[PDB]
Ligand binder design. Structure first.
Ligand SMILES: [Zn+2]
Lengths: 481, 50
């Protein structure tokens, strides 16, 4: 390994691929040469791996201390700059050890190079190359699972042994909430002990790959209380781990749940999906116009209540009327707008009959122009709702889904409320149900449901709000005649 | 008069004639977009009665 690497010199060189090849080859050959040593204690054991050795990376004259592994990851993920021959500013550098940030880095790549098909091709090649190297890492470094792995930690760390052999207090004073509290306390400790020791499972716990909390703790520490066929919690808990064994009484309780899961999946077959065709019919014709400003009045602009942090997130990449001026993009990160009703250009109120403008739709105009805007909205709402209804049957959690349907498919709330009240009710219903949709898509659905009593499309520029009547999704299709 | 005035009205529209024309038309036609025309036509037929 060399100890000084110039980033934009290699990226803008014509030897970019050869440099990655030899580093990639060098890292995997090192891993094949040596074993990984485990101490099963807080004082980790020493390993001589090149990926963990440090190099100095020079970005536009600034030196950052970066591991050899972070270097080869950076080169693979900086392929755009070799292709476009545009250097990498220091703004674009990110933490290469937290894989969560990669997603956001790809997002900045899309905005910088213009959401083009060319940058879309390079990101695909970056995801491909990153995955192929992961297999080489995995087949050379190796990954395993064993009960001896658990035993080896507990022999040094008494807390692991005590948690691996934990048994609930037999006080009758314990209750379902108390037992569930002990479940989190000992499980949160278990995951911490695994992250802070040199064990064969450390990389699993820190990466988040192949780890589910509940099921991990049942194998290692304690199963807990379990529901019966109809949801009532059975008075007796399962005070063992799967690794230690089960009791005959406990075996019946598990079989009850497994049977209940099977019965539930038989009931889960129901999938009406009637609304999917209705919503698609109204919204398929809605299109976009390359007109920056349709022309609308601020009182005709939609007013929305930012009651929760969830509300501002729905309105990103959209316009907002600042108190000092007008028509500035709302920053979702600023919590100053929380608790303030704000005036927003809406696709509902766009004047042009042909399509919705660039200010009312939002900054997603150039991003989603290639696809059908209405069909984008119907799928963003249908796929969660269809999935959420089925997932809720397994567990007031089901109620938001019903009210969402009633809002758009019945005239219960449509006939006696305004659009400003209708859209805000929609975002309230989505927030409670957990559906994550940007409000522009939900408003487009309401826009077609909204049918003008006045029957004039371009009257929106008039300061007076046009006379209108919202309609039910099936009735609006019927109103066409 | 009270039956004519539903609770869901705004005082501004009371003095607007075309709103009342649309209200008259709504009884005959369900669609809210053609209401006005129907009302006007009905007025003509009303005048024909005598
Ligand atoms: Zn508009």
């Amino acid at each position: 390994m060399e100890k000084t690497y110039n980033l934009n010199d290699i990226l803008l060189s014509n030897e970019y691929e050869k440099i990655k090849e030899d580093i990639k080859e060098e890292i995997i050959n090192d891993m094949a040469s040596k074993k990984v040593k485990y101490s099963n204690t807080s004082e980790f054991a020493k390993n001589d791996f090149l990926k963990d050795e440090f190099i100095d990376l020079v970005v536009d004259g600034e030196t950052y201390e970066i591991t050899y592994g972070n270097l080869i990851t950076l080169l693979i993920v900086a392929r755009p700059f070799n292709h476009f021959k545009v250097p990498m500013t220091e703004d674009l550098l990110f933490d290469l050890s937290d894989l969560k940030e990669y997603q956001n880095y790809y997002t900045t790549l899309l905005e910088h190079f213009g959401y083009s098909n060319e940058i879309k091709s390079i990101i695909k090649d970056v995801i491909s190359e990153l995955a192929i190297f992961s297999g080489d890492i995995n087949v050379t470094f190796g990954n395993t699972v064993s009960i001896k792995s658990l035993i080896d930690l507990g022999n040094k760390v008494k807390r692991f042994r005590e948690l691996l052999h934990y048994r609930l207090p037999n006080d009758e004073a314990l209750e379902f909430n108390d037992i569930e509290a002990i479940i989190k306390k000992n499980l949160d400790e278990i995951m911490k002990i695994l992250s802070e020791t040199d064990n064969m499972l450390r990389y699993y716990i820190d990466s988040g790959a192949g780890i589910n909390s509940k099921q991990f703790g049942q194998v290692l520490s304690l199963v807990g209380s379990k529901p019966d066929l109809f949801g009532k919690i059975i008075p007796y808990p399962i005070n063992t781990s799967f690794l230690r064994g089960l009791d005959v009484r406990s075996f019946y309780i598990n079989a009850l749940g497994a049977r209940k899961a099977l019965i539930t999946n038989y009931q889960q077959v129901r999938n009406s999906g009637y609304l999917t065709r209705k919503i698609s019919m109204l919204l398929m014709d809605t299109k976009l116009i390359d007109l920056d400003d349709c022309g609308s009045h601020e009182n005709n602009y939609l007013s929305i209540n930012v009651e929760n942090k969830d509300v501002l997130k729905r309105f990103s990449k959209r316009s907002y009327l600042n108190n000092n001026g007008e028509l500035v993009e709302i920053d979702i990160n600023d919590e100053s707008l929380i608790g303030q009703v704000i005036k927003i250009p809406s696709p509902t109120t766009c004047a042009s009959n042909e399509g919705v403008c660039r200010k009312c739709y939002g900054k997603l105009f150039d991003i989603n122009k290639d696809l059908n805007i209405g069909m984008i909205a119907v799928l963003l709402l249908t796929d969660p709702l269809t999935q959420r209804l089925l997932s809720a049957k397994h567990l007031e959690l089901s109620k938001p889904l019903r009210e969402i349907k009633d809002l758009i498919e019945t005239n219960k709330y449509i006939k006696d409320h305004n659009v400003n009240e209708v859209v805000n009710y929609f975002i309230y219903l989505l927030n409670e149900s957990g559906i994550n949709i940007q409000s522009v898509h939900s408003e487009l659905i309401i826009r077609e449901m909204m049918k003008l009593d006045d029957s004039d499309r371009t009257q929106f520029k008039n300061d007076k709000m046009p006379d209108y009547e919202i309609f039910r999704i099936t009735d609006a299709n019927l109103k066409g005649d | 008069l009270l039956n004519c005035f539903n609770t869901r009205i705004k005082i501004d529209k009371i003095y607007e004639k075309d709103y009342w024309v649309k209200k008259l038309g709504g009884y005959f036609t369900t669609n809210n977009s053609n209401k006005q025309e129907k009302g006007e036509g009905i007025i003509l037929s009303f005048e024909r009665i005598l």
